[PDB]
Write a protein that binds this DNA or RNA. Structure first.
Length: 1215
RNA sequence: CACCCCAAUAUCGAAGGGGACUAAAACGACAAUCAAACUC
């Protein structure tokens, strides 16, 4: 359980009626110099006396609440059935059941039910008694355990009258099962039931009772009993506190508790302690590790421990069959006999700690087995043996590594304090948390700097023939343009004044951009700290060019009517109503907390289809052309409804936000800024390990917005009249070019006010302008997440900026591809573009590139071209008209977009052949055309209900009910349709077969693959950045204790460690810190090597160019050059080792990566917890990933095998 | 194979507990298996 958690165990009397006892969650809060205890409820935040509190905790922990509690909530005849009477007697057994006792229907005859009524009571009464006796047992044996609920369960199951109850239930079931429709209606009814307050737990056990299609096992009933028993907090564990003999030792006991539980923590211990004792042990340890004196120092003490008897000593109890805390005794007892005593011995403090470290480590292994034994008894862990959890050889290796971690953490903790400059006297928990927040932002920012350097490398390359090596623009100067520049870049680069006319490099780029970028890169890295600092470099004129650049990208609204208002010309009327909404640009600050429109989109989609009235969608065109216009309007309506300012005094209507704040808050108390507090509370929950915290809050906001859409904008989805077209195509064309009739309906399009206030906002916005939307997204949301966590408004501007640069990026991509192009006469367009070698026509064609178009045509042609006589209609109307062939090219946007993309040719392989095979039934079959319109959804609708019906039921139950549904066709028929299951299964694979092909032919796989490359490389990027940060901690820590000597700072060197590039004085030249003499560095490098960090070239980090893991990842060569030289797996291995200096990071890498694929494979998390190298051997290894399931059911996904293998290829491919 | 931390502690019913303070998770532009009795 928990104190200072969600369990409410602490008890405070209710204010309205003093007698009533109300239960509260209580917490620790730092008051300034010390922790204090506050109650932690929205209603109450009162301080708690430490002394009152500790006693209550101890009192709470031993209280025999349970018997009074079980009776207080329950009595026979209210325990389940609520079959009760007694003529004014509240609870009793056996007596006094009052036995044999808008439309009203009374009928004759149903004699039998009276027979079953009694059956109810024989049921409920037996149950109450069964429990009472067990609670009545004694100690109890049952509730004195840590896994008490399970013991209760085994006792409940075993050798009890419960089995008769199953028989009674079955008997009740049998009469209902066949004989009377009424019997079922009634049999269910005598359950409370529906109204007051009831526990989902009960409803499901009812739902199993009222169902004869599913079997009922005695297990289902027992499980209900404990769950009901917990549900009402009747059942708790009885744990006796340490025994004490008089008040003076009781006083001492309660004081160390208050220390252990309320008073101290990592920081608090550090502050009080302890005349320099800790530093000495760590100093003691570092030397011993360097010496190699250590292993035998541990290896000997381990034997003092005498493990083998302990393994024997432990084994004996486990067979005793409790599977509990008694294990710690056998351990506690064993230590007492083998070890002192007190006489042995007066020993060095450093020596003593190895005993504590060893002791408490092995006490951690005693938890390993105990956790396992519970984890083997239920389902499968499974069946691991002590024998090789204690493994004196394995233990020796593990124990050593825990000693280096201890020694390491302390060094780093001091360094972290040092490098930041937090005062060692006031360190507290509150400061450390807000330091985490930025530390997280800092890792992201640096990675951001490192992608923009990757982008800059492509645009810019060294003048000399000699070096093809990376250019570190920041932290660095006679650059010359790269040979392979996109020419998309020059326009941005030219605009920025980075490039002089003729493409020669600008003066400004050297001071304005590079100088600022580096100083800014170093404020992040060096915890600077200061004025920031440029009085300084950068000016509004310099800045204004940036603002003007952002403004230029946006297409005007008038242009962005290629979503055909033909659609809306019905129906003109809603559009004026929306523009007519008045909003204020204040930004409110509520808006930040609401979901992205991307979240709400699907429901908006969902409703329009869900709405009954709308007609079937013709081909498509139309649906693509109807939804898209609708989505964009909804996207801009989502925003206007949020920014709407308060309505004028005579409107009945509620502004959307006001309805939302009213829904989330209780009635009559609607005076609050509750939106923010829900997000902030939901963000904290997520922090403490509730991953649904933020989705659950989101979907509320959505539900409420979807409501608001239905109530005020119903017509926008109400489309009684529509046509499949061409008539629409005609409509757009007939409409198009009636230039004299220029005017088209348009959405408001807002207005733009970009402003820059610092040099920092301007390097970032520039950087934003330089790399992909996927990347700017990651650091945007990190700007967001920090601002909320720290409750600052520093970053709000750059967010708005970064938002704008993005909405402009993805709208420009709306206009140009569909409208400016595609020309559709590609050989012609290439000569139309080559002739070319705000506005939409028109110039945005800059993005259009001749080489790319040629490539696009060529790759499509490869797909189209027939081999031999064998030719094809297939791919018709997908890539070509219709008619025919080369005359026109269809715009498969997914293919056209990107093709950046050094990767693309490499990435495309393993898609490219597979594209050719797929038949187009898209097209191809009326069945194929049919599958989309009626049926992709038909299944989704069917799976949905099944999921909803199922949820919260056990896997064991779901499994049979599911088998029963497969097995009995008549049972299956109700839900959903096309009974039986066999028929459904075939429609499922049918859609499963539509979606497989569809994904290849629009090349959805490029998107998935291109995403995998950036995420994986991005997290791996974070991680080298963490390592770099750590070295600063290691140096600072090593220095703060007097174990290393530094005479200087080489400011303007980012890195904390030096190269052997030298030749001499490299140590005081290479690194940010300055070392006194080789000895200093020679000692440093050695202490480091002790922890698994190899600082002597060439050691992974220092291999000359792109040979170090560091350089390969940090220069982003998994997105730009995949598969060259090294397997992605090879490299995932090689970082997972570079970080092996700190157990904290164990399988940090592996986990990090495979969650990039969580969505499209079925990760075995158990097997991701074990040790492994993917890269070497371990062919068997994935394994790590299993094919995806859904329908729960667990039906194989439309692309389960293909995607999972696609990934496998991706990682391993090494050519 | 998570990791760190909490005593009078080498060891003492810590057989307890803390952890935005630490990784992982989460978040992420465009984009899915998980009081009682009376009132209904």
């Amino acid at each position: 359980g928990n104190l200072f958690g969600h369990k409410r165990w602490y008890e405070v009397r209710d204010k309205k009626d003093f007698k009533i006892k109300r239960k509260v969650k209580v917490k620790r809060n730092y008051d300034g110099n010390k922790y204090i205890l506050n109650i932690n409820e929205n209603n109450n935040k009162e301080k708690i006396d430490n002394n009152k509190f500790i006693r209550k905790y101890i009192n709470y922990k031993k209280n025999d609440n349970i018997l009074k509690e079980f009776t207080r909530k329950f009595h026979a005849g209210n325990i389940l059935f609520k079959l009760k009477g007694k003529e004014g007697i509240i609870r009793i057994e056996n007596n006094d059941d009052f036995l044999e006792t808008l439309r009203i229907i009374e009928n004759d005859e149903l004699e039998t039910k009276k027979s079953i009524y009694e059956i109810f009571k024989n049921i409920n009464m037996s149950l109450y008694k069964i429990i009472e006796k067990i609670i009545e047992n004694e100690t109890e044996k049952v509730f004195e355990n840590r896994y008490y609920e399970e013991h209760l369960r085994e006792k409940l199951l075993k050798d009890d009258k419960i089995d008769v109850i199953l028989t009674n239930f079955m008997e009740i079931r049998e009469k209902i099962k066949s004989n009377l429709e009424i019997l079922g209606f009634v049999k269910f009814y005598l359950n409370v039931g529906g109204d007051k307050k009831k526990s989902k737990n009960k409803k499901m056990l009812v739902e199993k009772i009222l169902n004869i299609n599913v079997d009922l096992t005695v297990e289902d009933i027992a499980d209900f009993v404990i769950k009901e028993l917990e549900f009402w907090n009747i059942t708790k564990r009885i744990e006796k506190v340490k025994k004490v003999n008089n008040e003076f030792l009781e006083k001492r006991r309660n004081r160390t508790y208050i220390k252990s539980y309320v008073l101290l923590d990592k920081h608090e211990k550090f502050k009080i302690e302890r005349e320099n004792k800790k530093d000495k042990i760590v100093k003691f340890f570092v030397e011993n590790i360097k010496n190699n004196s250590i292993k035998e120092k541990i290896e000997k003490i381990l034997a003092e421990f005498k493990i083998d008897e302990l393994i024997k000593k432990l084994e004996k109890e486990l067979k005793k069959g409790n599977c509990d805390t008694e294990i710690f005794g056998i351990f506690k007892k064993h230590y007492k006999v083998n070890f002192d005593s007190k006489k042995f011995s007066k020993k060095s403090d450093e020596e003593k700690e190895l005993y504590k470290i060893i002791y408490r480590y092995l006490k951690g292994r005693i938890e390993k087995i105990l956790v396992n034994e519970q984890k083997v008894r239920l389902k499968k862990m499974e069946k691991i043996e002590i024998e090789k959890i204690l493994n004196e050889s394995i233990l020796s290796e593990k124990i050593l590594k825990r000693v280096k971690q201890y020694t390491l953490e302390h060094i780093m903790y001091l360094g972290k304090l040092r490098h930041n400059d937090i005062d060692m006297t006031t360190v507290n928990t509150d400061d450390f948390s807000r330091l985490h927040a930025k530390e997280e932002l800092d890792l992201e920012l640096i990675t951001f700097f490192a992608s923009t350097n990757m982008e800059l490398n492509k645009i810019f390359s060294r003048e000399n023939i000699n070096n093809d090596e990376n250019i570190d623009f920041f932290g660095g100067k006679n650059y010359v343009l790269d040979k392979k520049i996109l020419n998309s870049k020059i326009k941005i680069i030219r605009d920025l004044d980075f490039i002089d006319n003729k493409n020669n490099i600008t003066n400004n780029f050297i001071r304005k951009f590079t100088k600022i970028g580096t100083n800014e890169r170093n404020r992040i890295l060096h915890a600077i700290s200061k004025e920031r600092d440029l009085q300084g470099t950068q000016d509004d004129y310099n800045k204004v060019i940036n603002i003007i650049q952002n403004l230029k990208i946006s297409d005007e609204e008038v242009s962005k009517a290629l979503n055909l208002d033909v659609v809306f010309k019905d129906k003109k009327n809603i559009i004026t109503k929306i523009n007519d909404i008045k909003i204020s640009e204040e930004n409110n600050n509520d808006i930040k907390y609401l979901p992205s429109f991307s979240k709400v989109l699907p429901e908006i989609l969902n409703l329009y289809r869900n709405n009954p009235k709308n007609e079937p969608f013709d081909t498509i065109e139309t649906e693509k052309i109807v939804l898209n216009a609708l989505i964009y309007v909804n996207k801009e309506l989502y925003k206007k409804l949020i920014l709407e300012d308060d309505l004028e005094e005579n409107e009945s209507k509620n502004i959307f936000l006001q309805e939302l704040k009213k829904t989330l808050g209780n009635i009559d108390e609607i005076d609050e800024n509750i939106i923010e507090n829900y997000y902030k509370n939901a963000q904290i929950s997520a922090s403490k390990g509730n991953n649904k915290a933020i989705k659950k809050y989101q979907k509320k906001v959505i539900e409420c917005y979807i409501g608001y859409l239905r109530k005020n904008y119903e017509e926008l989805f109400d489309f009684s009249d529509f046509k499949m077209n061409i008539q629409e195509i005609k409509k757009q064309i007939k409409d198009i070019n009636d230039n004299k009739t220029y005017e088209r309906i348009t959405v408001k399009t807002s207005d733009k006010t970009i402003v820059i206030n610092d040099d920092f906002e301007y390097i970032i916005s520039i950087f934003a302008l330089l790399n992909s939307n996927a990347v700017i997204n990651k650091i945007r949301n990190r700007f967001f997440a920090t601002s909320v966590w720290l409750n600052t408004s520093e970053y709000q501007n750059i967010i708005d900026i970064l938002d704008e640069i993005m909405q402009l990026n993805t709208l420009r991509n709306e206009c140009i591809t569909e409208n400016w192009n595609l020309n559709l006469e590609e050989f012609i367009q290439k000569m139309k573009e080559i002739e070319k070698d705000i506005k939409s026509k028109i110039l945005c064609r800059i993005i259009f590139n001749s080489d790319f178009l040629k490539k696009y045509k060529k790759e499509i042609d490869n797909l189209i071209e027939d081999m031999e006589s064998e030719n094809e209609n297939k791919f018709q109307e997908i890539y070509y008209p219709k008619e025919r062939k080369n005359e026109l090219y269809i715009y498969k946007k997914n293919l056209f977009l990107n093709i950046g993309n050094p990767n693309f040719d490499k990435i495309y392989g393993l898609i490219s052949n597979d594209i050719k095979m797929a038949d187009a039934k898209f097209l191809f079959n009326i069945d194929g055309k049919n599958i989309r319109k009626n049926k992709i959804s038909e299944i989704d609708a069917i799976l949905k209900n099944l999921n909803d019906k199922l949820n919260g039921y056990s896997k064991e139950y779901k499994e049979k009910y599911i088998k029963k549904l497969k097995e009995n066709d008549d049972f299956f028929a109700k839900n959903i349709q096309n009974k039986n299951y066999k028929s459904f299964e075939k429609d499922y694979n049918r859609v499963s077969e539509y979606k497989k092909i569809r994904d290849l032919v629009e090349f959805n796989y490029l998107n998935k693959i291109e995403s995998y490359l950036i995420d994986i490389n991005w997290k791996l990027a974070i991680q080298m950045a963490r390592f770099e940060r750590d070295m600063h901690y290691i140096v600072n820590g090593l220095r703060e204790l007097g174990i290393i000597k530094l005479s200087g700072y080489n400011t303007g060197i980012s890195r904390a460690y030096p190269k052997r590039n030298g030749s001499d004085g490299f140590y005081t030249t290479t690194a940010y810190y300055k070392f006194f003499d080789e000895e200093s560095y020679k000692k440093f490098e050695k202490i480091c090597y002790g922890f698994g960090i190899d600082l002597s070239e060439n050691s992974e980090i220092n291999k000359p160019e792109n040979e170090s893991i560091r350089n390969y990842i940090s220069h982003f060569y998994i997105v730009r050059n995949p598969f060259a030289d090294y397997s992605i797996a090879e490299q995932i291995d090689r970082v997972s080792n570079l970080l092996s200096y700190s157990t904290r990071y164990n399988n940090s890498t592996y986990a990090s990566v495979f969650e990039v694929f969580k969505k499209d494979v079925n990760l075995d998390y158990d097997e991701l917890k074990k040790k492994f190298k993917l890269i070497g051997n371990n062919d068997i290894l994935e394994r790590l990933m299993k094919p995806k399931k859904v329908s729960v059911l667990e039906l194989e996904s439309y692309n389960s095998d293909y995607i999972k293998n696609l990934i496998i290829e991706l990682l391993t491919k090494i050519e």
